[PDB]
């Protein structure tokens, strides 16, 4: 009964103001940091803004470091975004997604494990680079299919590595399947398998089914901005 929902999107003018809200439920809100993820029309992810478990420090990416500002009500357990100075490049879904880092040891970096169902925003008229590859790729049912991703620099750090994979269906957020590059998530299906390293990753369906039509995101956590790949499209021949 974990539940994020999103509320506040709006239409709104060049230069102006919007305030975000993402309201918790079922767990212990102050246990955990949180992020808002922005889903642009090109499909890319984007995080926008993180803060830690207590609220007190807070990052924010070069795209929007002076006009956006997350906070954290614990008492309320809801999440926020004041955003400001708005521009073209902000139209987007805004997702709150909650940081899982398990298990934790020394240098352990987490990951995505819950999302609300995002709020539309629409503004009128040294990162690490993952690139993904293929696109686009189609299957037949009981094939395999093999999604490559490539960071611009290593995203390992203490023996392991902070590669994601996440999958996306229409209309829903997404959805982790494997974090640190080859754990599988509780509630996976033993059909998704990652592996790799350093700065070369893979993920593996085997068999193909036709619940797996989805596009397939990586995202690494090695380093500040997390950042994602730009989605493979996985459809049936």
């Known amino acids: 009964q974990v539940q994020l929902q999103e509320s506040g999107g709006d239409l709104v003018q060049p230069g102006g103001s919007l305030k975000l809200s993402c309201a918790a439920s079922?767990?212990?809100?102050?246990?955990?940091?949180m992020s808002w993820v922005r889903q642009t029309p090109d499909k890319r992810l984007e995080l926008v803004a993180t803060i830690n478990s207590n609220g007190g420090s807070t990052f924010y990416p070069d795209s929007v470091k002076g006009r956006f500002t997350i906070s954290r009500d614990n008492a309320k357990n809801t999440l926020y975004l004041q955003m400001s100075s708005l521009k073209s490049e902000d139209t987007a879904m805004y997702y709150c997604?909650?940081?899982?880092?398990?298990?934790?040891?020394?240098?352990?970096?987490?990951?995505?494990?819950?999302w609300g169902q995002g709020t539309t925003v629409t503004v009128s008229s040294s990162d690490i680079e993952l690139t993904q590859s293929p696109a686009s790729l189609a299957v037949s049912l009981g094939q395999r299919a093999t999604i490559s991703c490539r960071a611009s620099e290593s995203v390992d750090s203490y023996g392991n590595s902070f590669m994601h994979w996440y999958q996306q269906k229409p209309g829903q957020p997404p959805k982790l399947l494997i974090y640190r590059a080859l754990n599988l998530e509780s509630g996976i299906p033993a059909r998704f398998s990652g592996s790799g390293s350093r700065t070369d990753f893979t993920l593996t369906i085997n068999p193909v089914e036709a619940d797996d039509v989805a596009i397939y995101y990586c995202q690494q956590s090695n380093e500040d901005p997390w950042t994602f790949g730009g989605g493979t499209k996985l459809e049936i021949k």
């Open positions: 079922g767990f212990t809100f102050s246990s955990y940091g």
């Open positions: 997604a909650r940081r899982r880092n398990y298990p934790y040891y020394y240098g352990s970096r987490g990951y995505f494990d819950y």
